[PDB]
Ligand SMILES: CCCCN[C@H]1C[C@](O)(CO)[C@@H](O)[C@H](O)[C@H]1O
Ligand SMILES: [Ca+2]
């Protein structure tokens with residue numbers, strides 16, 4: 001099946017979810033990347049409070065989440081500090 | 084308070100020179116003494132009354148330039164010749180005697196078309212292309228050369244100039260037939276098109292610290308570039324008066340013709356005539372003499388947050404966090420003089436900045452930089468190691484009795500290192516090593532202020548004329564390059580500390596011809612008022628024309644508190660100017676951009692996002708400035724030399740040839756009048772995508788968030804649409820290309836890429852220069868310089884085409900890949916075509932076809 005933007009603006013093939021290009025006006029098709037200006041990246045942050053961050057801070061080379069999962073392809077290795 | 088500063092009448096050499104009025108010159112060339120040499124023609128000149136003998140050295144130069152030098156035949160003492168400003172000995176062209184009579188010798192440069200006519204009596208020079216007169220020298224007979232007499236004493240207010248060499252001033256006039264518009268000779272808080280000086284003061288070039296300077300007047304400010312450009316419908320010319328002493332410039336209009344007269348306190352006459360014919364020819368001619376804009380590290384083209392002063396390390400970190408908490412980008416936070424130990428530079432206040440390395444480490448973890456101020460005045464303090472070293476090694480500027488000069492500045496009593504001494508500059512450069520400048524780190528950069536030099540208890544708030552420098556030269560001989568030497572030694576220090584790898588960033592207040600090689604400048608202590616916002620355009624445009632492309636003004640104004648609307652408009656203005664820094668006086672209220680009401684915050688954030696989105700475009704323009712000498716920010720007349728209605732415009736400007744900017748600069752404005760030039764030219768409003776045909780004056784309604792910006796048809800602008808918290812975060816991100824189609828359905832653009840901060844682009848050719856071109860129905864990416872290769876993940880995520888119809892299909896071809904189909908979106912109202920995710924590496928050749 002295809003994916004539908006949560007705001008109903010479009011329906012796209014599921015291979016355009018997290019394909020590093022913003023296809024949904026609400027940013028819902030790119031929860032795991034920095035592609036959308038209004039998106040959010042969810043940090044589970046086990047051992048502390050889970051956090052939402054701006055999509056623009058995914059792989060920006062800055063450690064935003066204590067669990068470090070926002071930096072997975074940036075050259076910055078973030079140690080886990082959720083303690 | 085202007086009684087602090089001499090008018091021409093209160094300057095005895097300006098009074099003497101300016102009293103000489105247009106008439107029959109007493110100088111005469113002795114044609115019996117003429118010698119035609121390998122690089123030059125020399126001929127003796129004589130003053131008919133005084134019988135003083137001078138030598139004229141006349142040279143044709145490669146790239147259609149002429150150099151005129153005049154010195155005494157038998158000087159009692161050597162005259163000053165400006166060192167370190169020319170980047171090379173200019174390659175010469177052979178002169179030939181191609182005509183002669185009783186009173187004249189005609190010279191040909193190489194094999195033509197340029198000719199120089201030397202008239203013997205009265206002495207005169209005329210410059211021609213073929214039979215067209217370009218320029219005359221001494222046509223009004225204003226040449227004056229005060230020779231060195233047997234070794235006057237002068238006082239101004241409470242300061243005494245011993246003037247041990249007496250009157251030594253030099254001057255010369257130039258006639259520009261057909262020219263009605265002249266520009267340049269910064270720095271003055273005055274209009275772009277220079278005014279006639281006939282009924283008032285001459286323009287003054289003497290690097291001075293003017294407290295609360297006022298607008299629309301010819302008083303000398305902090306920097307001096309003795310370069311004048313002349314523009315007409317038919318031709319462009321430039322005059323480069325290579326003199327480092329106090330200089331006054333008279334301008335008179337008289338078939339239309341403009342006469343220029345330079346009057347300098349000492350040194351020789353040394354002037355370059357740059358014959359164009361186009362203004363870009365003039366840019367190249369001047370760049371070959373004094374060099375080009377240093378390529379800024381990318382971060383320094385982002386947004387700088389500054390004030391006098393941030394309180395301590397905690398304040399600095401709070402400001403850093405404030406940007407991220409309010410979703411506003413920023414690359415650098417600045418530390419003004421209160422960060423040091425009582426204005427002892429290279430130190431840190433032990434209570435408020437106890438751990439600078441840890442503060443710099445925290446900023447590096449946000450991928451941000453810091454700038455620390457380092458001024459050239461050194462506190463007289465036996466516990467201050469810098470002062471003890473400079474004192475012990477005799478590296479200070481001296482007085483005539485041989486003691487070290489002492490004046491007053493920020494730390495109280497202070498001495499001034501002799502930056503004209505190469506041993507002093509090497510010492511200064513070595514002081515920036517990470518072992519010497521303790522607490523500094525690779526993400527700390529430098530601001531040189533007060534380097535005119537500013538001397539609080541000195542005449543005109545600067546150093547005494549009869550202070551003595553390296554080689555025995557007087558301060559009056561060298562004054563206008565003192566600041567440049569500070570800028571240069573600081574920039575060299577930032578390079579050396581890295582082992583020669585990192586590009587520097589240094590902001591300087593004082594400057595001279597050649598300062599473009601060492602970093603950025605700004606217009607000093609402006610005021611939080613609407614007219615100071617307006618004047619930032621003509622001031623930075625006058626700097627751009629003379630090679631200083633890395634220019635800006637304090638956003639919000641340095642003095643006083645701007646109202647929120649003025650601050651919003653200043654952010655919008657600054658976001659489209661080369662050096663983009665907010666700064667403020669010690670006693671102003673805090674005005675970090677999130678402290679405003681949300682509507683003002685939002686407009687400012689929008690301006691910051693636009694600036695960061697445009698960094699690839701800015702970086703390419705600076706690469707083009709670095710390689711070719713073309714200015715980044717440009718008057719409309721540079722792009723439209725035949726449209727006479729642009730010759731004085733200074734409320735509008737262009738960035739390269741692609742973007743026309745008209746920032747709102749009036750409180751409560753409901754619209755602006757935008758002049759869109761060019762016959763058969765179209766312009767795209769980048770907010771609405773509406774196309775407009777030139778030439779017209781368009782009335783455009785505005786709101787608080789409006790920044791009137793238009794993209795020229797025929798251009799392709801690269802943008803990073805993923806705005807992040809700093810430029811370092813963005814430098815691997817994909818590019819969106821904005822193609823604005825000409826009426827012929829064409830466009831072209833370039834893009835420069837490298838590691839963002841080293842000299843590897845130069846030493847290893849590690850860079851990319853791409854050409855993007857559109858014609859027919861095909862967009863092509865090719866190499867504009869095959870020597871450049873770069874490892875980069877940057878790819879093309881989007882193409883936006885303005886002025887295009889709906890295609891039936893879109894097809895991408897890239898070498899190494901199968902042909903692919905691209906999806907797309909089209910707006911019939913705006914004729915805007917968006918091509919989705921080409922996905923091709925920016926280092927790859929590729930083409931997109933609209934079928
Ligand atoms: C009343 C102060 C006048 C001089 N201002 C200079 C010094 C300083 O104020 C502090 O270093 C800087 O903030 C300005 O930017 C400089 O131009
Ligand atoms: Ca997607």
Ligand SMILES: [Ca+2]
Nearest residue numbers: 057060062064
């Ligand atoms: Ca991050």
